[PDB]
Amino acid sequence: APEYWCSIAYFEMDVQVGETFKVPSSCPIVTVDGYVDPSGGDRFCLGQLSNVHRTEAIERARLHIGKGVQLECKGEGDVWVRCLSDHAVFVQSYYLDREAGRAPGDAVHKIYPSAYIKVFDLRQCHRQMQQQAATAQAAAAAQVDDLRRLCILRMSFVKGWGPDYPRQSIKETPCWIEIHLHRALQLLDEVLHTM
Amino acid sequence: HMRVYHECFGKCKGLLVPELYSSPSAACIQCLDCRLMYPPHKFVVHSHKALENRTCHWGFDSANWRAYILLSQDYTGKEEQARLGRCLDDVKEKFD
Ligand SMILES: [Zn+2]
């Protein structure tokens, strides 16, 4: 159904660099790195992107996102991350938040070099999405964007962010990307129509 | 010889001394803080007080240390950054 299984938007600090890269379903795996190829079929290259606001300090971090990450869609819409960089990648996913054992959105996950972790489960998302939906339905009195956080992945490239680091939010990191899984987004647009 | 570092459960710096790495278990990296010798796979679980315990670590394999230990940032470009880099690759390629 989804012409593209996800669309990626790159950011350096709080400025979006480049156009949102849309990944086609014909491409399960996509690579996000810092090198040549100024085009991109299954390669979103950050090494040739302009940014007037870029600072020397940001350029330094861009040099370390070597081979970057590899985003892989399995089955209907489950996601996996492969760290091809020499430096860990920091991810933000409700999936890991749980699997880890912590509360909803209350953990930053450090994915190590060469690691290959699953960071998003479609079903768990669809279920959890219906839950909180009906939960809000139950707000009776007398006399929606909270749901798409579950269908989204945010990951930083060389700088972590959180209680253990000098950065409070991902928007303070030198280079990160926001990922909207389209299939999960459909279910969202379904859990509401169907609600 | 080799100025080395890693960013695992904190970070650490050290000295890789090629001539000492003559067996998988040979402590050939010396912490630049405690000055002790560490086998490549133990050096990777040695950060000094740098802690980092409110972040979930996924996929940390100590055996995957060849992806963890990197050449110091001490960029003196020219052909020393490349020469020492090539010698670091040799260390990695040896007992696998
Ligand atoms: Zn030490």
GROMACS .gro file of C-alpha atoms and ligand atoms in nm:
model
  292
    1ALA     CA    1   0.000   0.000   0.000
    2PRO     CA    2   0.277   0.247   0.096
    3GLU     CA    3   0.452   0.369  -0.220
    4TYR     CA    4   0.741   0.449   0.015
    5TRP     CA    5   0.797   0.264   0.342
    6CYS     CA    6   0.943   0.565   0.520
    7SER     CA    7   1.072   0.917   0.465
    8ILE     CA    8   1.387   1.054   0.625
    9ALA     CA    9   1.463   1.413   0.721
   10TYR     CA   10   1.819   1.518   0.812
   11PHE     CA   11   1.902   1.784   1.075
   12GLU     CA   12   2.216   1.958   1.200
   13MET     CA   13   2.122   2.093   1.541
   14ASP     CA   14   1.774   2.238   1.488
   15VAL     CA   15   1.798   2.314   1.115
   16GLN     CA   16   1.680   2.070   0.848
   17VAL     CA   17   1.946   2.009   0.586
   18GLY     CA   18   1.851   1.878   0.245
   19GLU     CA   19   1.513   1.759   0.122
   20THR     CA   20   1.324   1.484   0.298
   21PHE     CA   21   1.451   1.162   0.146
   22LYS     CA   22   1.166   0.919   0.072
   23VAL     CA   23   1.252   0.548   0.061
   24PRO     CA   24   1.056   0.335  -0.193
   25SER     CA   25   0.910  -0.004  -0.095
   26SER     CA   26   1.121  -0.159  -0.371
   27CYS     CA   27   1.408  -0.075  -0.133
   28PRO     CA   28   1.397  -0.260   0.202
   29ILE     CA   29   1.743  -0.143   0.301
   30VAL     CA   30   1.868   0.214   0.275
   31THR     CA   31   2.205   0.360   0.372
   32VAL     CA   32   2.256   0.701   0.531
   33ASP     CA   33   2.620   0.812   0.535
   34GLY     CA   34   2.868   1.093   0.475
   35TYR     CA   35   3.038   1.048   0.135
   36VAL     CA   36   2.997   1.099  -0.243
   37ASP     CA   37   2.677   1.005  -0.436
   38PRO     CA   38   2.489   1.343  -0.444
   39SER     CA   39   2.182   1.161  -0.584
   40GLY     CA   40   2.052   0.850  -0.408
   41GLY     CA   41   1.831   0.552  -0.482
   42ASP     CA   42   1.893   0.345  -0.169
   43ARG     CA   43   2.165   0.587  -0.051
   44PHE     CA   44   2.089   0.910   0.135
   45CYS     CA   45   2.426   1.087   0.120
   46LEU     CA   46   2.496   1.366   0.366
   47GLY     CA   47   2.851   1.447   0.257
   48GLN     CA   48   2.751   1.691  -0.015
   49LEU     CA   49   2.470   1.880   0.159
   50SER     CA   50   2.489   2.255   0.216
   51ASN     CA   51   2.393   2.439   0.532
   52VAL     CA   52   2.467   2.809   0.579
   53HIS     CA   53   2.416   2.758   0.953
   54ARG     CA   54   2.674   2.482   0.969
   55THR     CA   55   2.951   2.547   1.220
   56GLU     CA   56   3.308   2.422   1.231
   57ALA     CA   57   3.207   2.215   1.534
   58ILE     CA   58   2.931   2.051   1.332
   59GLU     CA   59   3.164   1.981   1.040
   60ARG     CA   60   3.379   1.789   1.286
   61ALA     CA   61   3.098   1.551   1.376
   62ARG     CA   62   3.005   1.501   1.010
   63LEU     CA   63   3.353   1.363   0.941
   64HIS     CA   64   3.291   1.086   1.193
   65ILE     CA   65   2.961   0.955   1.056
   66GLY     CA   66   3.160   0.745   0.813
   67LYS     CA   67   2.961   0.461   0.666
   68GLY     CA   68   2.667   0.575   0.878
   69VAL     CA   69   2.371   0.351   0.948
   70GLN     CA   70   2.167   0.112   0.746
   71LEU     CA   71   1.792   0.117   0.791
   72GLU     CA   72   1.618  -0.210   0.713
   73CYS     CA   73   1.245  -0.279   0.682
   74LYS     CA   74   1.142  -0.639   0.756
   75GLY     CA   75   0.804  -0.793   0.690
   76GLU     CA   76   0.513  -0.552   0.671
   77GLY     CA   77   0.691  -0.267   0.846
   78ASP     CA   78   0.934  -0.365   1.121
   79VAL     CA   79   1.261  -0.173   1.138
   80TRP     CA   80   1.623  -0.264   1.203
   81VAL     CA   81   1.937  -0.056   1.233
   82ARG     CA   82   2.290  -0.159   1.142
   83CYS     CA   83   2.569   0.069   1.266
   84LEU     CA   84   2.834   0.078   0.992
   85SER     CA   85   3.006   0.374   1.156
   86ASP     CA   86   3.314   0.372   1.382
   87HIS     CA   87   3.103   0.562   1.625
   88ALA     CA   88   2.788   0.440   1.798
   89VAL     CA   89   2.451   0.573   1.694
   90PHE     CA   90   2.196   0.703   1.945
   91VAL     CA   91   1.837   0.605   1.883
   92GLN     CA   92   1.501   0.707   2.019
   93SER     CA   93   1.239   0.432   1.990
   94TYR     CA   94   0.940   0.335   2.200
   95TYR     CA   95   1.016  -0.021   2.099
   96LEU     CA   96   1.354  -0.021   2.268
   97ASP     CA   97   1.217   0.196   2.551
   98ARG     CA   98   1.001  -0.104   2.638
   99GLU     CA   99   1.219  -0.400   2.545
  100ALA     CA  100   1.483  -0.228   2.756
  101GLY     CA  101   1.249  -0.218   3.053
  102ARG     CA  102   1.205   0.156   3.098
  103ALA     CA  103   0.897   0.378   3.074
  104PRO     CA  104   0.757   0.524   2.751
  105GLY     CA  105   1.005   0.772   2.604
  106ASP     CA  106   1.253   0.778   2.891
  107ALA     CA  107   1.569   0.624   2.756
  108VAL     CA  108   1.827   0.691   2.490
  109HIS     CA  109   1.959   0.381   2.323
  110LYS     CA  110   2.323   0.359   2.229
  111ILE     CA  111   2.365   0.126   1.936
  112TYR     CA  112   2.725   0.015   1.907
  113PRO     CA  113   2.950  -0.006   1.601
  114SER     CA  114   2.862  -0.297   1.373
  115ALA     CA  115   2.569  -0.384   1.596
  116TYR     CA  116   2.248  -0.483   1.420
  117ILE     CA  117   1.945  -0.408   1.633
  118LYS     CA  118   1.571  -0.416   1.569
  119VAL     CA  119   1.437  -0.077   1.677
  120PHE     CA  120   1.072  -0.090   1.574
  121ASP     CA  121   0.796  -0.351   1.575
  122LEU     CA  122   0.486  -0.277   1.364
  123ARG     CA  123   0.240  -0.493   1.557
  124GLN     CA  124   0.352  -0.372   1.899
  125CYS     CA  125   0.297  -0.028   1.752
  126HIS     CA  126  -0.049  -0.098   1.617
  127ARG     CA  127  -0.156  -0.253   1.945
  128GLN     CA  128  -0.004   0.018   2.164
  129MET     CA  129  -0.155   0.278   1.929
  130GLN     CA  130  -0.511   0.146   1.977
  131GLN     CA  131  -0.450   0.133   2.352
  132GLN     CA  132  -0.366   0.498   2.413
  133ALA     CA  133  -0.630   0.588   2.154
  134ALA     CA  134  -0.913   0.426   2.349
  135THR     CA  135  -0.745   0.560   2.662
  136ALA     CA  136  -0.808   0.920   2.547
  137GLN     CA  137  -1.152   0.818   2.425
  138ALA     CA  138  -1.191   0.771   2.799
  139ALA     CA  139  -1.184   1.127   2.920
  140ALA     CA  140  -1.543   1.188   3.024
  141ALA     CA  141  -1.647   1.511   3.190
  142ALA     CA  142  -1.973   1.693   3.250
  143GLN     CA  143  -2.131   1.947   3.485
  144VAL     CA  144  -0.350   1.289   1.796
  145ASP     CA  145   0.014   1.386   1.741
  146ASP     CA  146   0.086   1.190   2.057
  147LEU     CA  147   0.006   0.886   1.848
  148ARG     CA  148   0.255   0.956   1.573
  149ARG     CA  149   0.546   0.959   1.815
  150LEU     CA  150   0.500   0.581   1.818
  151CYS     CA  151   0.530   0.570   1.439
  152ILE     CA  152   0.855   0.765   1.445
  153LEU     CA  153   1.227   0.703   1.493
  154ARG     CA  154   1.486   0.961   1.586
  155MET     CA  155   1.852   0.877   1.586
  156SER     CA  156   2.169   1.076   1.636
  157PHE     CA  157   2.491   0.996   1.450
  158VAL     CA  158   2.794   1.057   1.673
  159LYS     CA  159   2.675   1.247   1.976
  160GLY     CA  160   2.444   1.095   2.234
  161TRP     CA  161   2.199   1.306   2.427
  162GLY     CA  162   2.041   1.263   2.766
  163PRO     CA  163   2.116   1.247   3.140
  164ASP     CA  164   2.457   1.101   3.064
  165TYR     CA  165   2.561   1.369   2.818
  166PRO     CA  166   2.603   1.745   2.773
  167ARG     CA  167   2.305   1.753   2.532
  168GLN     CA  168   1.948   1.763   2.658
  169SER     CA  169   1.756   1.684   2.340
  170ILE     CA  170   1.837   1.536   2.003
  171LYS     CA  171   1.790   1.886   1.857
  172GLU     CA  172   2.120   1.983   2.020
  173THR     CA  173   2.317   1.709   1.843
  174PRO     CA  174   2.523   1.807   1.534
  175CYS     CA  175   2.360   1.560   1.299
  176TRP     CA  176   2.059   1.337   1.330
  177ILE     CA  177   1.764   1.215   1.124
  178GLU     CA  178   1.390   1.175   1.179
  179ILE     CA  179   1.220   0.868   1.040
  180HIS     CA  180   0.850   0.837   0.967
  181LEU     CA  181   0.748   0.479   0.901
  182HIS     CA  182   0.462   0.510   0.652
  183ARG     CA  183   0.299   0.174   0.720
  184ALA     CA  184   0.278   0.256   1.089
  185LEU     CA  185   0.149   0.597   0.989
  186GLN     CA  186  -0.134   0.433   0.791
  187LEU     CA  187  -0.244   0.227   1.091
  188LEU     CA  188  -0.252   0.552   1.287
  189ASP     CA  189  -0.477   0.699   1.018
  190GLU     CA  190  -0.674   0.379   1.057
  191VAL     CA  191  -0.699   0.348   1.432
  192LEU     CA  192  -0.869   0.688   1.414
  193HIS     CA  193  -1.102   0.637   1.118
  194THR     CA  194  -1.190   0.291   1.255
  195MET     CA  195  -1.206   0.408   1.617
  196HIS     CA  196   5.382   0.341   1.865
  197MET     CA  197   5.002   0.347   1.861
  198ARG     CA  198   4.790   0.614   2.030
  199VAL     CA  199   4.456   0.440   2.077
  200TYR     CA  200   4.107   0.506   2.214
  201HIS     CA  201   3.753   0.381   2.252
  202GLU     CA  202   3.412   0.515   2.345
  203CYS     CA  203   3.239   0.219   2.504
  204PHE     CA  204   3.097   0.253   2.854
  205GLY     CA  205   3.256   0.593   2.887
  206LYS     CA  206   3.581   0.635   2.693
  207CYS     CA  207   3.943   0.555   2.742
  208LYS     CA  208   4.277   0.618   2.584
  209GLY     CA  209   4.581   0.405   2.563
  210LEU     CA  210   4.896   0.292   2.404
  211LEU     CA  211   4.889   0.002   2.160
  212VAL     CA  212   5.237  -0.150   2.162
  213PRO     CA  213   5.242  -0.372   1.850
  214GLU     CA  214   5.550  -0.567   1.958
  215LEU     CA  215   5.362  -0.697   2.263
  216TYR     CA  216   5.052  -0.828   2.087
  217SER     CA  217   5.188  -1.178   2.028
  218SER     CA  218   4.886  -1.388   2.136
  219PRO     CA  219   4.509  -1.320   2.152
  220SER     CA  220   4.535  -1.280   2.529
  221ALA     CA  221   4.843  -1.056   2.546
  222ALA     CA  222   4.784  -0.735   2.739
  223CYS     CA  223   4.932  -0.498   2.481
  224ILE     CA  224   4.725  -0.182   2.532
  225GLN     CA  225   4.817   0.033   2.827
  226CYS     CA  226   4.564   0.267   2.979
  227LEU     CA  227   4.695   0.622   2.969
  228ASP     CA  228   4.541   0.683   3.310
  229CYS     CA  229   4.609   0.382   3.534
  230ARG     CA  230   4.909   0.298   3.317
  231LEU     CA  231   4.824  -0.074   3.342
  232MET     CA  232   4.834  -0.323   3.053
  233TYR     CA  233   4.514  -0.449   2.894
  234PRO     CA  234   4.437  -0.724   2.643
  235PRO     CA  235   4.247  -0.563   2.352
  236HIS     CA  236   3.917  -0.722   2.456
  237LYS     CA  237   3.940  -0.612   2.820
  238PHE     CA  238   4.065  -0.264   2.731
  239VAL     CA  239   3.724  -0.218   2.568
  240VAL     CA  240   3.545  -0.257   2.899
  241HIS     CA  241   3.777  -0.020   3.075
  242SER     CA  242   3.668   0.344   3.095
  243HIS     CA  243   3.800   0.538   3.392
  244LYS     CA  244   3.521   0.669   3.619
  245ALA     CA  245   3.365   0.784   3.296
  246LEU     CA  246   3.041   0.604   3.363
  247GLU     CA  247   2.739   0.613   3.133
  248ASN     CA  248   2.467   0.426   3.313
  249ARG     CA  249   2.132   0.581   3.216
  250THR     CA  250   2.167   0.503   2.850
  251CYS     CA  251   2.086   0.154   2.721
  252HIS     CA  252   2.372  -0.011   2.539
  253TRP     CA  253   2.275  -0.242   2.255
  254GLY     CA  254   2.501  -0.483   2.074
  255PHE     CA  255   2.810  -0.431   2.282
  256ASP     CA  256   3.012  -0.742   2.217
  257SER     CA  257   3.354  -0.747   2.375
  258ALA     CA  258   3.468  -0.978   2.097
  259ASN     CA  259   3.366  -0.704   1.857
  260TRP     CA  260   3.648  -0.490   1.996
  261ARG     CA  261   3.810  -0.452   1.649
  262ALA     CA  262   3.525  -0.215   1.567
  263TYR     CA  263   3.570  -0.029   1.894
  264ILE     CA  264   3.938   0.057   1.924
  265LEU     CA  265   4.034   0.355   1.708
  266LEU     CA  266   4.342   0.563   1.617
  267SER     CA  267   4.382   0.880   1.825
  268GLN     CA  268   4.240   1.199   1.678
  269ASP     CA  269   4.588   1.342   1.697
  270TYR     CA  270   4.568   1.423   1.326
  271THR     CA  271   4.920   1.505   1.199
  272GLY     CA  272   4.780   1.421   0.856
  273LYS     CA  273   5.068   1.363   0.614
  274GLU     CA  274   5.174   0.999   0.596
  275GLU     CA  275   5.175   0.918   0.965
  276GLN     CA  276   4.799   0.923   1.006
  277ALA     CA  277   4.791   0.673   0.719
  278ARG     CA  278   5.102   0.479   0.819
  279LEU     CA  279   4.985   0.429   1.179
  280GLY     CA  280   4.637   0.360   1.054
  281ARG     CA  281   4.773   0.078   0.838
  282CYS     CA  282   4.964  -0.060   1.136
  283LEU     CA  283   4.645  -0.051   1.344
  284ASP     CA  284   4.469  -0.256   1.074
  285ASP     CA  285   4.753  -0.507   1.098
  286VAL     CA  286   4.704  -0.540   1.473
  287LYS     CA  287   4.335  -0.603   1.421
  288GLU     CA  288   4.404  -0.860   1.148
  289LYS     CA  289   4.616  -1.115   1.327
  290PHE     CA  290   4.442  -1.338   1.573
  291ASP     CA  291   4.150  -1.285   1.343
  292ZN      ZN  292   4.291   0.271   3.310
   0.00000   0.00000   0.00000
